[PDB]
Design a protein. Structure first.
Ligand SMILES: O=c1nc2n(C[C@H](O)[C@H](O)[C@H](O)CO)c3cc(O)ccc3cc-2c(=O)[nH]1
Ligand SMILES: [Ca+2]
Ligand SMILES: [Ca+2]
Lengths: 319, 320
């Protein structure tokens, strides 16, 4: 009936596809729907760039579930052109390191016009989703600003500087000496409309195998959201993103193992979040209070991920 | 060595090229010129659209004098795409290269820069070889008052919406210059009109291209008082197949599409009007009391023919 998933990045979007294929939602609708998919989507990477508002995780989910995503980039449109970006370069304006594709820009333009006219992000997203018809509710973790910053040592002058996550990841490639993460605005952000209720009324809550520190983690920094998870009746099942990201675990000093990431989220039995923790084939993890089972955890295609989604329901004991 | 031109539309940009060709400015420069071209540019078609500020006449002048216009289409960039517009259409609500200009312009305006300075910043890239002064740094947007067919009410529509959607489809009652009364003349505009050796009104549409410049407080007063001669060019070209058609915007204000009527619209400086001279196309006549009228070729076939057109205006004014 009702399943809620926390997501970020391309992995979160690909996980949602697996849920949809499993329950006949969205593009995979084969007859009358009998379940509802709700995604709580990271806003930590959102940024104003060139006077327009970029919501990468919401867009990636919207584009992916709607059949518009670039299969080889994982972000932005299929058949994208970059003529507006080329002309911005010809004007010599900055930032020159962030790619605003022509098709993509229409999304940013409509979004920005609505937000400046007072529409909250949740409403903008549903307005944009009417065109894409993703077959899932894409809820921004908040309608208020909550942006992940990165504290680095700047290589041009050796000075400490905070840069938005986008500049750290897209411009520096996570290649600069990096000291910590800051979730600027998280404590002052309210849980987005429907977010607490979606976590509270779910039959199960799933954590997509997205980046733990900078995709899922920032969702968990919104005060209302972490409490909903601790207080909800539904089982909470996490998927480990460690199959062998590594850069962001290092910054907060956590090992890059399914065991360490499991204890990063922690056990509901204690002060933590998880009731179950699924890890990849051949991987072993043990958390007291957390049901751990090793299963195939590679999102090869919507069919393989659907099995991944099933593995979580089975461990949660939910039908 | 100082010539000021009021301009709007594609005709205004083509006229500026002729001035540049005559005085060796911009693209037609050989060695450093000793003349200065200043354009006073209509802002009446400017609009916020899709959250960005679109300024059509300033951009047309900037792209044209900067050599960025597509020679075989005559409008817009070379190698222009319309993919963002395609997606805007799919969303149910504007060239891709064009959008870059709007993105840069809007960021500057929202950061406190006035339109005059925004224009100077964009011109560093285009280098049009002319000073492009917005008629005002305040909003003054030309609307058209229609009878709306959903409810039969008078409604003001932005001229650009009227032009594609409502023109010739519903009763059209008047023009309104929204914001004009609260607008001041743009920086350097009054001084450009006052210090010129000659002021030219390009053969743009008189009501909605030149006309709205004249609604900006201060600009009409500068025109009446300047010591420079004021020479207007008629936009009426007779001899077309089927005798052409009447200008639709002149029709809204019930003015005939003749060089005589457009001349009387601007009127004579000797009276309450604006012209010292009025050039009409060969084979055409106008007689207005106080106004020197001469028929000469008035087709902007190429910068060379436009250069001759500009030369005739200096000759009519008696300015070297
Ligand atoms: O590495 C890049 N990632 C780009 N991304 C992806 C984005 O960086 C994501 O924030 C991270 O890739 C992690 O999700 C975009 C996402 C959008 O919604 C819109 C535009 C972009 C542009 C880029 C880009 O130019 N380079
Ligand atoms: Ca707040
Ligand atoms: Ca009525």
């Amino acid at each position: 009936m009702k399943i809620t998933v926390l997501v970020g990045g391309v992995g979160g979007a690909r996980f949602l596809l697996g849920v949809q294929n499993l329950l006949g939602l969205g593009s995979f609708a084969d007859g009358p729907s009998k379940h509802e998919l709700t995604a709580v989507v990271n806003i930590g990477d959102d940024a104003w760039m060139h006077g327009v508002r970029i919501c990468p995780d919401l867009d990636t989910c919207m584009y992916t579930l709607g059949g518009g995503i670039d299969p080889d980039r994982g972000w932005g449109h299929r058949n994208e052109t970059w003529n507006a970006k080329e002309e911005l370069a010809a004007y010599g304006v900055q930032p020159d390191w962030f790619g605003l594709g022509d098709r993509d820009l229409a999304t940013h333009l409509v979004r920005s016009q609505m937000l400046r006219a007072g529409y909250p992000l949740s409403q903008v997203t549903e307005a944009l989703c009417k065109r894409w018809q993703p077959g899932a509710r894409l809820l921004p973790a908040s309608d208020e600003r909550s942006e992940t910053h990165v504290v680095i040592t700047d290589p041009t002058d050796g000075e400490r500087r905070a840069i938005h996550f986008q500049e750290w990841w897209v411009r520096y490639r996570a290649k600069v000496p990096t000291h910590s993460f800051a979730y600027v605005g998280a404590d002052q952000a309210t849980a987005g409309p429907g977010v607490v209720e979606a976590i509270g009324d779910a039959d199960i809550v799933l954590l997509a195998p997205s980046n733990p520190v900078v995709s899922i983690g920032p969702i968990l920094q919104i005060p209302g959201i972490r409490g909903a998870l601790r207080s909800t009746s539904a089982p909470v099942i996490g998927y480990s993103p460690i199959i062998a990201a590594d850069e962001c675990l290092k910054v907060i000093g956590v090992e890059s193992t399914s065991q360490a990431v499991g204890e990063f989220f922690g056990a509901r039995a204690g002060t933590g979040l998880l009731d179950g923790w699924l890890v990849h084939e051949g991987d072993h993890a043990q958390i007291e209070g957390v049901k751990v089972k090793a299963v195939p955890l590679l999102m090869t295609d919507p069919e393989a991920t659907a099995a991944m989604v099933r593995a979580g329901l089975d461990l949660a004991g939910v039908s």
